[PDB]
Amino acid sequence: NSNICEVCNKWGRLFCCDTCPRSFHEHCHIPSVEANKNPWSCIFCRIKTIQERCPESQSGHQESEVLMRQMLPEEQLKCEFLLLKVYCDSKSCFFASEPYYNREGSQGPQKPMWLNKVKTSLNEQMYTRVEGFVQDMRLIFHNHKEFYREDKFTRLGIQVQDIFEKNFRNIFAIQETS
């Protein structure tokens, strides 16, 4: 197994996947690494099994159909994995915890949102459809763009949104377009 956490790239108290070489901190894995379960398979492994059991699940889809899906177990898992793919980028630090807003010439967003809030909301089964999760995720970056205005710090929102959107298109097999 690897000697660093796949998500945050630091060593520490790591849990090792039995079916691949990845390792994780307890709360870096999503869902949090399960108490028992020997062998244990990580989220990467679980996502790979879905594709292998239904090869046609990789044929292109329309975003509008994906968003209306109900959060059954497989969609729950895919959203967890997409969330984890964001936390894998070190720039997710800026969006992880609850923000506050006090900048001359700007007003805070009407609906603040952050990664740890989305994490909790997944954990507590608060999304009934994929659309709920994706709207909250895109809201994080949209709030950041609006607040920061012409400050060059706005670019951090563009960068992490790009990671989100590439991974969304990959995980949910969105039809490729020009």
Which spans of this chain sit near Zn ion (rule: CB under 5 A)?
A: 5, 7-8, 17, 20, 22, 25, 28, 42, 44-45, 54
Q: Output phi, psi for 49, to 5 deg.
A: -60, -40
Find the helix packing angle between 130-148 and 73-87, rounded to 10°. 30
Cβ distance to Zn ion smaller for residue 32 or 154: 32
In 3D, which of 132, 89, 97, 133 has the Cα closest to residue 114? 97
Residue type, 125: Q
Cβ nearer to Zn ion, comparing 13 with 111 = 13
* Closer residue to Zn ion, CB minimum distance, 91 or 155: 91
d(CA 161, CA 159): 5
Shortest gap between Cβ of 59 and Zn ion (angstroms)?
11
Residue with tokens 């999304």: 127
CB of 28 to Zn ion, least distance (A): 3
DSSP SS3 for 25: strand
CB of 81 to Zn ion, least distance (A): 12
Task: Scan for tokens 């790979």, then name that residue.
Answer: 48
Residue 161 CB, nearest approach to Zn ion (Å): 22
Q: Which is nearer to Zn ion, 49 or 175 (CB)?
A: 49
